[PDB]
Design a protein around this ligand. Structure first.
Ligand SMILES: *[C@@H]1O[C@H](CO)[C@@H](O[C@@H]2O[C@H](CO)[C@@H](O[C@@H]3O[C@H](CO[C@H]4O[C@H](CO)[C@@H](O)[C@H](O)[C@@H]4O)[C@@H](O)[C@H](O[C@H]4O[C@H](CO)[C@@H](O)[C@H](O)[C@@H]4O)[C@@H]3O)[C@H](O)[C@H]2NC(C)=O)[C@H](O)[C@H]1NC(C)=O
Ligand SMILES: *[C@@H]1O[C@H](CO)[C@@H](O[C@@H]2O[C@H](CO)[C@@H](O[C@@H]3O[C@H](CO[C@H]4O[C@H](CO)[C@@H](O)[C@H](O)[C@@H]4O)[C@@H](O)[C@H](O[C@H]4O[C@H](CO)[C@@H](O)[C@H](O)[C@@H]4O)[C@@H]3O)[C@H](O)[C@H]2NC(C)=O)[C@H](O)[C@H]1NC(C)=O
Ligand SMILES: CCCCCCCC(=O)OC[C@H](COP(=O)(O)O[C@@H]1[C@H](O)[C@H](O)[C@@H](OP(=O)(O)O)[C@H](OP(=O)(O)O)[C@H]1O)OC(=O)CCCCCCC
Ligand SMILES: CCCCCCCC(=O)OC[C@H](COP(=O)(O)O[C@@H]1[C@H](O)[C@H](O)[C@@H](OP(=O)(O)O)[C@H](OP(=O)(O)O)[C@H]1O)OC(=O)CCCCCCC
Ligand SMILES: CCCCCCCCCCCCCCCC
Ligand SMILES: CCCCCCCCCC
Ligand SMILES: [Zn+2]
Lengths: 343, 332, 124, 343, 330, 330
């Protein structure tokens, strides 16, 4: 124990933690990898996603070489704060959390050679800009970028510990998504220029695709059935004015109920998504079905219907006879164009 | 207090927190028990629950053994910062904190043999993946995973202190929406490339209560569907009555479904509740569509009518019963 | 920008009353606080009063208090300065000024962005 | 001021704040009283309440005796943290705030005798489990328990400063409740046993009663008037089939609108309360009224109503004549049984 | 800079933050002035408002007197942790903080005669018990109570530094739903069994804007109630038309009433708006009953008289109901 | 390596952080530039917006000049606690923080002459008082006020570093509901009771996207209004049909108005959308009220005349209402 204890007290002798390793001598190379324990929920309203990770960083500091019985030292949390570590941050982070229960969820190890392995457990909220034009049939690439806040690429460079594809690992039970499928990810790195210089940026994109089954049973199917129900009025006799007026006006109120609820589910954007157009067209169809009867009723001559046992009677409207074909056909065509366009 | 002050100061003189008990020796065994105070919330949207508990850890540290005092020394909780404690953490916790009013809700109690009792009052929001396909008839299994951040089983070993009596307070938990059916304690050693790591799991089985959904969702939907069948008993010539009945039931059914979408916890995929509401919507849709057929055959193709209604007076009640049997058998 | 023009000035006998109107057009919402100043023949601009956007809040100079009142009408974008019990000292050029939402105190002319060409009021 | 300054330095000379007063010698007796500045809002959804208190604790520490011109000493916040104070906590607390504006809202006074008076201003959120089966006619006793976190009753014992009833005082204007009436409070003390030992617990229960006038005018009366409206249909003539079908069906939709909104006010609990049962019965009465007319219409023969001058005409349905009595009476009976049960 | 550096080190050297200025002597007089930044929120559900202000305290400390420098030392905010400051707190304050970006929003300014100026930028949520019986025609009075924690008037005194001008920035307040009608400053001593404690109170009176509720609540209810009277002008034998009108007005009125319950801030007791909506609901309920009576007295057993009578009584009684309502609430 | 370590030690040896550079001399000039990472929320309910930016400050501190090191010293951000930094704050911010994962997002870079580059990553919620009279056809102007808390213009002066290029990233911002039409940089002095203070303002002009509201809010109301005129083309004697159409379109209009969440029910004062929805509500109200006259003036006592004119007046008057409305609000 004494041999182990002496090394720790000796390590920070003359060590300046305000200076990065190899200052003014070379570039400090940081090898990093991520293990995503759970790709947390994605928020369309906030355009952000949560991600729980074990963020791992490795680099070399010659000032921390040591000799002794053991080849690896586990520094204390107080010791870890006495030495220089990379100032890695997330470029698109919104409000991240470093877990501190029951102790700080961090660990810093030192090998005899001066190699530091540094791990921490983080919950990161990150920005994921979403273009919801094709909603609910949209896909997104949510990014995760990080790098040094203060050190330009001439000072600190980041790299992946192994092949970039094998450096970000997601747990098999990590997907905590209700409305998305995690198709996969791509891992890259590059350079970013800002007002303070050029910096190395390590990037990861999570490719997400929205599940559509919810919206078919909630929005599309009821809307389609309401439109079908508005056309069923064309098959009622023209003399039943109160029945076909109630049919048409109340189908309009049903579309309004469906149409309003569909938007309340949408994130508060101010452009027309795919579902907006489908609802608008369904509204026009149901609107046009009641306008059609206004024309049919305008040419009905007799207020009584055929009595079943035959005095002249109204003929079946030519507006109704054609509408029985034009309305189903036009709506059918609109569905092929809509569903082929977006799928 | 003079003798105790000397003894306490003696133990901490030269104490090295950076080194674990029996450093370089047999792994230190840390016994744990939990006293659950409450399970505050269970949110399907966030897929997590909030748990307040008293979290105790027991281990023996011969560096802290003292003799001559027949008392267990409870010390000001701030002394915990001067001792070595396990690097225990909750693997699936999202947000957690130690309560701090009036002081930090923390306890250190030494024992003559060196046993250390270290207790915290923790409120932790823990991630719980939920399978809500059978909602509201679903049963969930939420867990709490306890692991050592740094050490392996060569250094530290976990066990439930008291076996199945380690966790207490479950029977007193009341949830407005669920009921605790069971809880289990599991001890295991997860294996990675680095090595074996201690793991303790506390899991609860939650069975959702059904009373609210029966009266609020299933019962109203059933009654509206039965009401739509009233049209089959009205004369075919009463077009204004049967259409108003038929279309108003369609409107009523959408009102239930659209309003029972913003109140419910926004789970965007097809659940059991969605299927039942959709099925009832189809039945009222078909009941209205039936009169269109009755009207057309008489008025349209007249230049039979009672048969369609008489037949509808049996098939619709029968098929709805068949639909209900399949639904409840499939989901129960 | 905002454009201000005062009106209602003239000659009034001491002890009488007068009303000044200030008409504002432009980005009047960006400059919600309207303040009244007066320029004596020899002295500098002196703060008289001010009024908020809603008009429920107002402030007056100590000497001018309990004689003058300020009212607002966002519909017509006009602020009025009802002056009562006029005194010979009140003779001065009354300016209307508009202040931005974050410009500090009310009594300092430098904090007001836009000014009108103050109407003249002289008390005999 | 020198005499005052010297005493402060001498007090903490050799003082060990890790040891409670009388450790291993006697039991520390802490005298507590509470002044409730405001009994904050109660949240039925979260099943918790807020309470703003001045929490006062008094005990004796002979290690802090002194002699000087004064008899009472005020300790600075830095000095207060240097001595031993009870580790009091609230058992049912959820998240509590010790106010720190502009300075820490604490105060520690020491008398020459060695007695310490220690007051702090706190805002406490506490768990108040509610049994909402009688909602909206339910009453609750929200508790507030506290004690020592680490010291068993063999070490620290809590007592109320004066008569337990008079030790907790609620300011006259301190009731900040919207939907409750603070009937009163009961103050008790006892022993609670846990896995670590026996501890003293001080308990205070605030008895709340929900105000019902809101739900009478928002929920009960509209439901009662809609049920009455559904029965007015029995008095229409049996030949007005469209009117009585529209009448009955729209009252079902009106009940649905009332039922949907009535449960929004209720906390999202998964069991049935007293308001749900009342609405379910009103739903059943409105549903049955429309089924009543379906049976009346089945036995209607002539499609024309009485002409008003006198050819035969339908007779007033015996189902209607009986339904005009049975339906009002049965609803009347349900109300007496319902209200007498819950009131 | 060294001369001033040694001048400052001279002041703090030997300073005792644990003793108030003039310890054991006359009470230290602390003047206070507030520059109000905004009232961000006023919530009826929680019954509180959020206030941002610059809170300034001004007192004299002889131990901080410095000579030779003819300037008022503006120092770094971190020097505030090395001086004595008053233990002022806000009695009705639910939650508050000092802004901390980029640095802690705190100011210390010394003067040669030992006078200390101490400014803090504070956002505080203060409890405001509201009487919402007349809502939305209600007028609220929300205060801020300033008090000493552990001093009596024998040690510390409070006053509004500048009289009624001690508080500025009231014209900056822009509440969408209210308008500030008035504000007051009160200075008083609160006497308990333990002694007398200085108290300062700042209070605002708020008048709620009614225009939104005219368009959103009252006007739709009036037009629906009038629409229910269209039944009285239709034939007594148009049962489907008159029942559909009456029953659909009832459904429309419930829709207005139930959905307004969701948009409004959930105040669970009877208010002025509740009494008006229930009044209009009863009127449309009675109009539908009027036709039931007309239909029954004709087919079940004059008829034109009841409609003629209803054409006058209903509009007249509704006007009387409005007259009684607005007088009793306006 | 020790030579650099020794150099840094010399600078901080005896360094006084309570004293600004050139204390008592000319004011220290602080230059600022901002890189805007994103604008996240722009809420009308809270009347604020969130802003994540990289905030840089440049000033010259002779006490921090060093020689013999031909490099700019980027230092561990924890050294910022050992230096004087401007007491800059955002005068209109509601709540803000400096990001702290994995470490505090803070940068200190020195230059040989003594220039200090102090960068922070800040998310700030700033108050933006929005004018919603013309909503959703409204244009907003949101500002960010940057001011010194304690120091007057005699001590510290601000300037945008790089002129109008001092703020970058605005072109990249994407808002779900607005478009950044323009942004401006202003520099001025504000005079208070305690003296003049330097001010830097950054402001944006936001124009709301109107296309969405046309399909969601305006179009459905227009169609329902046209539907209510179908009554004028039905026989006067079809009382059941015309009342059902009239009262059901009134119900539909209430449905649209009640739970159209794009109406902003949480902000209670009149907006342009409110006027239009009530304009359409009045029209459907009158279309059903027109039938009371038509039905009465036939059965109660020309009958085709009222319908004949309504077929023109209602379409014509509604277009006149639309013309006046759009011109007034556009
Ligand atoms: C609630 O609010 C209170 C304040 O009302 C907070 O407590 C204060 O916290 C601040 C820090 O945030 C304290 O300020 C510190 O004061 C120290 C005083 O030094 C003492 O000891 C030395 C050495 O014996 C004596 O010479 C001296 O006279 C004093 O007796 C300073 O040393 C500190 O400076 C150090 O840290 C700062 C900041 O990093 C550095 O800039 C300095 O260089 C130096 O390293 C510091 O100024 C203040 O004293 C506290 N007040 C009290 C009464 O304790 C609470 O923290 C707050 N609670 C919560 C939960 O926020
Ligand atoms: C959102 O709304 C805000 C208001 O709330 C607008 O802010 C105003 O912006 C204008 C510029 O568009 C500012 O006006 C400019 O102020 C400059 C600084 O003035 C200071 O210095 C001068 C001396 O140089 C002093 O006289 C003065 O008192 C100040 O101390 C001026 O330099 C500018 O002058 C320019 O125009 C004038 C003519 O008006 C010319 O004579 C000059 O040569 C020069 O071209 C100019 O006056 C104004 O101060 C801002 N107001 C506030 C309250 O900050 C935002 O512009 C708006 N946002 C958007 C995007 O529109
Ligand atoms: C939104 C639709 C707008 C349509 C606007 C259309 C407006 C328009 O001009 O309509 C006129 C007519 C309506 O025909 P419809 O069948 O409805 O009405 C018959 C028609 O009026 C005959 O002329 C009558 O016989 P007669 O000889 O007078 O004795 C006959 O009386 P009865 O003997 O039976 O008692 C009526 O029933 O329609 C077309 O010709 C086009 C049909 C295809 C239109 C396809 C439209 C999709
Ligand atoms: C939910 C209701 C369920 C009811 C289930 C069904 C119950 C059931 O049996 O209904 C039919 C029957 C008749 O009802 P109702 O009076 O409507 O029908 C009359 C009946 O059919 C006569 O026989 C007819 O005369 P006639 O002989 O041809 O000359 C007469 O025609 P007209 O001379 O006017 O032209 C019809 O109007 O009702 C009862 O006896 C009430 C039982 C108590 C029901 C009490 C219910 C509260
Ligand atoms: C303080 C509690 C007040 C509760 C008021 C409840 C009133 C219930 C009245 C029920 C009347 C039913 C009449 C049915 C007539 C057909
Ligand atoms: C956006 C402008 C829409 C104008 C609609 C006018 C309809 C008039 C129908 C006669
Ligand atoms: Zn709704």
């Amino acid at each position: 124990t004494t041999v182990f204890t002496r090394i720790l007290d000796r390590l920070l002798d003359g060590y300046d933690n305000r200076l990065r390793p190899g200052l003014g001598e070379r570039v400090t190379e940081v090898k990093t990898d991520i293990f995503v324990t759970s790709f947390g929920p994605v928020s369309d309203h906030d355009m952000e996603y949560t991600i729980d990770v074990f963020f791992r960083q490795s680099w070399k500091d010659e000032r921390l070489k040591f000799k002794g019985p053991m080849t690896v030292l586990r520094l204390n949390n107080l010791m870890a704060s006495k030495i220089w570590t990379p100032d890695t941050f997330f470029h698109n982070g919104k409000k991240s959390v470093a877990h501190n229960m029951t102790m700080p969820n961090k660990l810093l190890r030192i090998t005899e050679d001066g190699t530091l392995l540094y791990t921490m457990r983080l919950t990161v909220r990150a920005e994921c800009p979403m273009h919801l034009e094709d909603f609910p049939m949209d896909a997104h690439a949510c990014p995760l970028k990080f790098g040094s806040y203060a050190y330009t690429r001439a000072e600190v460079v980041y790299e992946w510990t192994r092949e970039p594809a094998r450096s970000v690992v997601v747990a098999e039970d990590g997907s905590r998504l209700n409305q998305y499928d995690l198709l996969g990810q791509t891992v890259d790195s590059g350079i970013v220029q800002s007002s303070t210089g050029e910096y190395v940026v390590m990037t990861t994109h999570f490719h997400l695709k929205r599940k559509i089954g919810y919206f078919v049973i909630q929005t599309y199917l009821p809307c389609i059935m309401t439109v079908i129900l508005s056309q069923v009025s064309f098959w009622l006799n023209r003399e039943s004015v109160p029945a076909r007026t109630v049919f048409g006006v109340t189908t309009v109120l049903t579309m309004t109920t469906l149409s309003i609820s569909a938007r309340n589910s949408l994130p508060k954007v101010a452009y027309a998504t795919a579902m907006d157009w489908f609802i608008a067209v369904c509204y026009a169809f149901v609107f046009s079905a009641l306008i059609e009867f206004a024309t049919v009723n305008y040419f009905t001559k007799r207020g009584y219907a055929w009595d079943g046992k035959s005095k002249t009677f109204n003929s079946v409207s030519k507006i109704d006879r054609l509408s029985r074909i034009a309305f189903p056909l036009l709506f059918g065509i609109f569905n092929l164009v809509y569903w082929a366009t977006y799928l | 207090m003079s003798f105790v002050k000397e003894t306490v100061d003696k133990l901490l003189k030269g104490y090295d927190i950076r080194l674990r008990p029996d450093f370089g020796g047999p792994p230190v065994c840390v016994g744990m028990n939990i006293d659950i105070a409450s399970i505050d919330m269970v949110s399907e949207v966030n897929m997590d629950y909030t748990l307040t508990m008293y979290f105790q850890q027991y281990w023996r540290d011969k560096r802290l053994a003292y003799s001559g005092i027949p008392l267990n020394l409870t010390l000001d909780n701030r002394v915990a910062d001067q001792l070595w404690v396990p690097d225990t953490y909750f693997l699936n916790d999202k947000k957690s904190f130690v309560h701090g009013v009036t002081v930090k809700n923390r306890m250190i109690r030494l024992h003559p043999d060196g046993t250390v009792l270290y207790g915290l009052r923790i409120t932790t929001t823990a991630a719980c993946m939920m399978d809500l396909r059978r909602y509201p008839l679903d049963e969930q299994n939420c867990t709490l995973e306890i692991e050592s951040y740094g050490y392996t089983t060569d250094d530290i070993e976990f066990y439930w202190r008291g076996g199945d009596k380690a966790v207490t307070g479950v029977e007193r938990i009341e949830l407005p929406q669920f009921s605790i059916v069971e809880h289990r304690l599991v001890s295991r050693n997860v294996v990675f490339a680095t090595g074996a790591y201690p793991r303790l799991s506390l899991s609860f089985r939650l069975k959702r209560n059904i009373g609210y959904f029966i009266l609020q969702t299933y019962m109203p939907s059933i009654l509206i569907t039965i009401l739509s069948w009233v049209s089959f008993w009205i004369n075919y010539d009463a077009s204004a009555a049967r259409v108003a009945l038929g279309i108003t039931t369609v409107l009523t059914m959408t009102t239930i479904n659209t309003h029972l979408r913003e109140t419910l916890p926004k789970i965007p995929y097809v659940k059991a509740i969605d299927m039942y509401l959709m099925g009832c919507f189809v039945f009222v849709f078909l009941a209205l569509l039936e009169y269109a057929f009755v009207n057309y055959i008489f008025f349209g193709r007249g230049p039979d009518v009672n048969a369609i209604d008489r037949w509808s007076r049996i098939v619709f009640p029968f098929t709805f019963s068949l639909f209900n049997l399949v639904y409840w058998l499939y989901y129960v | 920008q905002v454009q201000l023009q005062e009106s209602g000035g003239g000659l009034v006998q001491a002890g009488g009353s007068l009303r000044l109107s200030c008409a504002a057009s432009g980005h009047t919402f960006n400059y919600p606080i309207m303040g009244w100043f007066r320029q004596a023949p020899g002295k500098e601009r002196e703060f008289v009063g001010a009024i908020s956007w809603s008009g429920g809040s107002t402030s007056y100079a100590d000497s001018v208090k309990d004689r003058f009142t300020i009212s607002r009408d966002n519909a017509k974008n006009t602020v009025y300065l009802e002056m009562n019990n006029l005194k010979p000292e009140d003779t001065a050029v009354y300016y209307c000024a508009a202040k931005g939402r974050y410009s500090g105190g009310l009594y300092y002319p430098t904090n007001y962005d836009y000014w009108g060409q103050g109407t003249q009021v002289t008390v005999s």
